[PDB]
Structure 1
Amino acid sequence: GNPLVYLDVDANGKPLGRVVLELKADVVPKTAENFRALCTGEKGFGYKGSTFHRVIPSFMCQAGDFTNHNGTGGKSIYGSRFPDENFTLKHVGPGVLSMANAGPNTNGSQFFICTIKTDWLDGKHVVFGHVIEGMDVVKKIESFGSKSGRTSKKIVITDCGQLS
């Protein structure tokens, strides 16, 4: 019942590989549907050709600001922002897919993939999926990050979509 979506990612134009994500529509259907639709681009906008703007090694890889490309932008398929659906899923370890926000009830399109357990975020960021394959691709993305979050190469989602 849960969608599988994919991100194909490159660094300075050179392909890194494919990340496949399960979206937990069974637990957070509104939040899963937002991410799913932004991967397909079927509302006329989405993640295709946007960047991972903030990458911090031993923490997470953040992306999804397709409007401003600096982490101050992005929007949902519902409107500019939508409520925190629930906090049932937890930041249990590497590969967890969660929503970036600017406080309670400010979910747009920005998201992050954890490269460690980020349990401090539990109850503050809505977890809505995890990495099914391509965690080696996430580590490659991670390697181009820095402690400050600034990336050493331009990391781009060159293509994305839905597998099932």
Structure 2
Amino acid sequence: VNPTVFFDIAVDGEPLGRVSFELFADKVPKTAENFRALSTGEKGFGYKGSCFHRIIPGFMCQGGDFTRHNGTGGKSIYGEKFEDENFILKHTGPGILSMANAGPNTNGSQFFICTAKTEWLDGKHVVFGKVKEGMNIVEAMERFGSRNGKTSKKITIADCGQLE
């Protein structure tokens, strides 16, 4: 019953591959629904065409800033930044999907995909999903990041949506 969504990733406009995610709606429904709706575009805005603006090899890939494309923007489907739903799920290794934020109760649309175990984030960022298929595509994305997070090629969500 947990929704599945996909990203089709491109690198300087060239197709790279598809990453799919299981969203833990059974455990974090508000946070999963936000990401699901942004991935279908059904509210009139969302992740299609946006980029991964910060990628640190061995750490995480961060994206979801579809309004300012650099980490300063993005917005939820709720008309305002929303609360940390819970911290039930932990950052237990590669593939974990977790919300970026600006401190307690400031969730918008930015998210990151862990490429390692990042337990120091537990209790600070809401974990709400995990890569289901295509972890190898995230690993190929990671190689275009750098120590300070700047990417050497433009990584983009060329398409996205909900699978069934």
Q: Specify if TM > 0.5.
A: yes
Q: Is this contact kept in 2: 1:47–1:160, CA < 8 A?
A: yes
Written as runs of structure 1 = structure 2, the 5 A alignment for 1:32-111 is 32-111=32-111
What is the count of residue pairs matched by the alignment? 164
The gaps in structure 1 that reach 5 residues or longer are none
Paired-residue identity, %: 75
Q: CA deviation at 1:17?
A: 0.2
2:52 alignment partner, SS class: coil
Matched, 1:142 2:110: no
* 1:13-44 Cα distance to aligned partner (Å, 9 max, x none): 11110000000000000000000000000000
1:138 alignment partner, SS class: helix
State the one-letter code of the partner of 2:83: P
* 1:83-104 Cα distance to aligned partner (Å, 9 max, x none): 0000000000000000000000
* 1:88-134 Cα distance to aligned partner (Å, 9 max, x none): 00000000000000000000000000000000000000000000010
Q: CA deviation at 1:46?
A: 0.2
The answer for the alignment partner of 2:118 in structure 1 is 118
State the one-letter code of the partner of 1:114: C
List, as ranges, runs of 4+ consecutive aligned residues in structure 1 with deviation greater than 3 Å.
none
Q: CA deviation at 1:79?
A: 1.6
Q: Is this contact kept in 2: 1:74–1:80, CA < 8 A?
A: no
* 1:34-76 Cα distance to aligned partner (Å, 9 max, x none): 0000000000000000000000000000000000001010000
The answer for the alignment partner of 1:154 in structure 2 is 154
The answer for the alignment partner of 1:23 in structure 2 is 23
State the one-letter code of the partner of 1:112: F
TM-score (norm 1): 0.99
* Aligned-partner Cα distance in 1 for 2:127–2:161: 20
Q: CA deviation at 1:80?
A: 2.8
